[PDB]
Write a protein that binds this DNA or RNA. Structure first.
Lengths: 96, 202, 104, 200, 14, 52
RNA sequence: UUGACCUCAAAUCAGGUAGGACUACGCGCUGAACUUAAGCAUAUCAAUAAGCGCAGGAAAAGAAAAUAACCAUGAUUCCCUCAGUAACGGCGAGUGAAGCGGGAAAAGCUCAAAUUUGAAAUCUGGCAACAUUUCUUUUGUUGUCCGAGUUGUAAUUUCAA
RNA sequence: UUGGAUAUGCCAUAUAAAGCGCUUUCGAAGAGUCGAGUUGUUUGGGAAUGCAGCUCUAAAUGGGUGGUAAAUUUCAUCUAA
């Protein structure tokens, strides 16, 4: 397959290199300062009404309909699940 | 109407096209204008070459990857290997392409040698006449405006000449390998699904 | 500042160290961003937040930021009064970092 | 830095704090004129991002624009022609209300160049925007190498010609296959010009 | 000490 | 009348070279020259070659 | 009672600026019908004409939230080619791009997000000097007062880091 | 009348400013915006190509795009407002 056009690892075999990391690909990494500021803003502002609804539903352990509510609010399951872990982490911290 | 031998007509001429017809009567006039501007630029920027040095890259497709063409500029990694500072390169006329990167030592060595030849054949005038500093020519009397194409062209890889036929080549089935590897790639996903499903069942 | 700056100039012209000519300043720290950095670095020992900042969001986060870093903070009236302290018209916040041993 | 805290607060738009501030401020902005000057930016962090500096020659105007779609100004809603062109109510305008905000503020201050603008508030009837404006005739602007570009005459009414950020978006200015048809006239004129060369 | 003030006292001396 | 009439007509380069070669060969033939109209009745030689 | 600040006014206040015309080319907005479909309503005409706003000697676009699936390419623009192609269509009449490749030309960068904090280091204006000139018509430098500015002007950094 | 060199004189406080070198390090990156649904309009863009209205509205290795809808998992690529 290597050096064969067809196959699984198709293509010419060359002396591979280690590409230096791109600074533009570091984006999305949570900084210490960004994490600290967002914690302060969370503690000052609070939660959105739908975030309260999802939190209450998860507390009642109706997770499936909590996920459905989050998806209907945000718009995607990817974002809906991401909010689910965020609010799940919040409630566990509150109970502890 | 349609009653004659030949193709069915397809003339996209139902808009007001006569307003937007484009004629080419200025084709020699445009050609002469480009040359005069080209000659003006060469006289304005002399002695340095009219066209900057470009790297040698490979086009990105199975249809063209066997050819070597000219790129936009030398990558940061290539300049660092050649010993040219990123800031200095743009001053002495070495284009720098931040977007490109060297995935193979073959391409890196190709352009590194390309820069090294350019540096060896380069004459850099001192900023102040009479005091050469680091990279700087002591004698600049013989400077002339030449062409980078004459000094250093983009050369395609030479077609391999005759080589002996080995026994390991003799006992090699080209068509069977092609069909086997195509089927191997085609059912790679199904095999992995079978193996994982069997594993969880076990 | 101008007289002190000039006096340093003749001192340098006279051939003297710039460090020993002028003493270390001891003054109130002002400006919203500068005070915020001091609180995050725990260098501010006292923070005075104006009660009538408009827009209010410029200082809404400040009591929480002061509380987390344990910086003593008070909400004082009249950003105009804070401005008069720092020779300006209005000041969002004032921060005291270092004071002399007489006023400790 | 307080601008990080302001940015994150502006992100939390459903918080009780921002809801209260939105209600009080939207009431106040509705009591004032439709195009009234803002003494200072209400979102100083947002203004700085877009290009505002707190110095002479920078001006900020608040404006409210009515919400909803575009209804044809045809008399009595009567169109003339094929039914495909007969709709009058559910039509929409091709520029954002933010673009309309800059147009009206730019026309209001005809001696200023529209730098940029930003949403500040909304309700059922209006959306409130703040438009950042630069004075090309001010020496603080003309001696500033960072903002000299707007002094050149090619930048007269960037908002009117769709050269702002929201203006480029409304024209569909972008890179790639998703923005192929734009600029519309330049692209269309290229594809509909009949190139008849000499030796053909 | 302040390097920018050092440039400024030099400027005033000049 | 329109300007996008075809004013220039394309000719194969090889045919142009064929016609140049034919025209040069004809210039070497004295009888064609007299037909063409040139008063060469007392020209010393055809083709006429002169010093540098 | 004086003041401070915020906000809002007034002046034939000091100094400026906007309008209108031209509109071949340029950026938008708005927007048809004749016509083709041998009728006709989707379609087409056409993202056209008319209407409206706004620029320059070009404008726009432009240093990737870009292609690709390669041995990978590398801002934009234009030309040839892709290509009357993929696709769209009462899948009817009709419509219809893009990647690569070749060329013309090539040039890169600037902010917001950082404590100068051992010193707002920044800037407009008045006044007074000097100076300079496509120019007694232009353009400034220096000094000094008022002011703007800490709700942030300089230096510093821009992801290629 | 201009242009770029030169040939010089003078003012230039380089205490400074900058490029490169390796860092067990940290590394701030644009929000009624992306995105989702829907309705108009557009495109060659076809379970939506762009744009706009309205409703809902994130995130932090996150978010775009990889031209057949959806869920999950990888891989490239780019770094928007």
């Amino acid at each position: 397959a290597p050096g064969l056009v067809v196959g699984l690892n198709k293509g010419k075999t060359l002396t591979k290199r280690q590409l230096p990391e791109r600074p533009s690909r570091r984006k999305g990494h949570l900084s210490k300062r960004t994490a600290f500021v967002r914690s302060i803003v969370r503690e000052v502002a609070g939660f959105a009404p739908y975030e309260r609804r999802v939190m209450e539903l998860i507390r009642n352990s109706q997770d499936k309909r909590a996920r459905k509510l989050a998806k209907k609010r945000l718009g995607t399951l990817k974002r809906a699940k991401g909010k689910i872990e965020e609010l799940t982490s919040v409630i566990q911290s509150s109970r502890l | 109407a349609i009653h004659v031998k030949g193709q069915l007509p397809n003339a996209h001429f139902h808009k007001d096209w006569q307003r937007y017809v484009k004629t080419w009567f200025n084709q020699p006039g445009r050609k002469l204008r480009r040359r005069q501007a080209r000659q003006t630029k060469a006289a304005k920027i002399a002695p340095r070459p009219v066209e900057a040095i470009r790297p040698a890259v490979k086009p990105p497709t199975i249809r063209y990857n066997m050819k070597v063409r000219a790129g936009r500029g030398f990558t940061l990694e290539e300049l660092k290997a050649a010993g040219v500072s990123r800031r200095v390169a743009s001053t002495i006329g070495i284009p720098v392409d931040h977007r490109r990167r060297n995935r193979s030592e073959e391409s890196l060595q190709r352009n590194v040698e390309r820069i090294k030849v350019y540096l060896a054949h380069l004459i850099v005038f001192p900023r102040k006449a009479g005091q050469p500093k680091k990279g700087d020519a002591t004698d600049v009397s013989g400077a002339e405006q030449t062409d980078v194409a004459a000094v250093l062209p983009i050369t395609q890889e030479a077609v391999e000449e005759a080589k002996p036929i080995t026994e390991e080549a003799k006992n090699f089935n080209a068509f069977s390998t092609l069909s086997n590897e195509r089927a191997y790639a085609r059912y790679a996903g199904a095999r992995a699904a079978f193996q994982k499903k069997r594993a969880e069942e076990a | 500042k101008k007289q002190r700056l000039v006096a340093e100039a003749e001192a340098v012209a006279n051939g003297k160290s710039a460090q020993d000519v002028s003493k270390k300043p001891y003054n109130v720290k002002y400006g919203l961003n500068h005070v915020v950095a001091l609180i995050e670095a725990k260098k501010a020992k006292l923070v005075l937040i104006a009660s009538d900042v408009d827009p209010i969001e410029l200082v809404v986060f400040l009591p929480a930021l002061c509380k987390k870093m344990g910086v003593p903070y008070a909400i004082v009236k009249n950003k105009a009064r804070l401005g008069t302290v720092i020779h300006q018209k209005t000041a969002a916040v004032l921060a005291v970092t270092e004071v002399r041993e007489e006023d400790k | 830095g307080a601008y990080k805290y302001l940015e994150e607060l502006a992100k939390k738009k459903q918080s009780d704090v921002n809801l209260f501030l939105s209600r009080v401020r939207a009431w106040e902005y509705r009591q004032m004129n439709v195009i009234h000057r803002a003494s200072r930016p209400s979102r100083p962090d947002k203004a700085r991002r877009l290009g505002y500096k707190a110095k002479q020659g920078y001006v900020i105007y608040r404006i409210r624009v009515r919400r909803g779609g575009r209804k044809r100004p045809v008399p009595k809603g009567q169109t003339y022609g094929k039914p495909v062109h007969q709709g009058v109510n559910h039509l929409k305008y091709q520029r954002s209300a933010r673009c309309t905000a800059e147009e009206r503020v730019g026309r209001y201050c005809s001696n200023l160049r529209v730098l940029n603008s930003y949403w500040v508030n909304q309700d059922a009837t209006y959306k409130f925007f703040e438009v950042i404006l630069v004075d090309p005739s001010h020496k603080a602007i003309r001696r500033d190498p960072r903002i000299n570009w707007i002094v050149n005459p090619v930048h007269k009414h960037r908002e009117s010609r769709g050269l702002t950020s929201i203006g480029k978006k409304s024209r569909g200015i972008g890179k790639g296959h998703r923005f192929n048809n734009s600029p519309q006239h330049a692209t269309w004129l290229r594809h509909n010009t009949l190139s008849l060369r000499r030796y053909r | 000490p302040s390097k920018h003030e050092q440039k400024r006292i030099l400027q005033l001396a000049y | 009348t329109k300007t996008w009439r075809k004013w220039h007509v394309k000719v194969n380069q090889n045919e142009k070279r064929y016609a140049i070669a034919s025209a040069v060969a004809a210039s070497g033939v004295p009888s064609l020259l007299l037909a063409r109209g040139h008063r060469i009745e007392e020209i010393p030689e055809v083709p006429l070659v002169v010093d540098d």
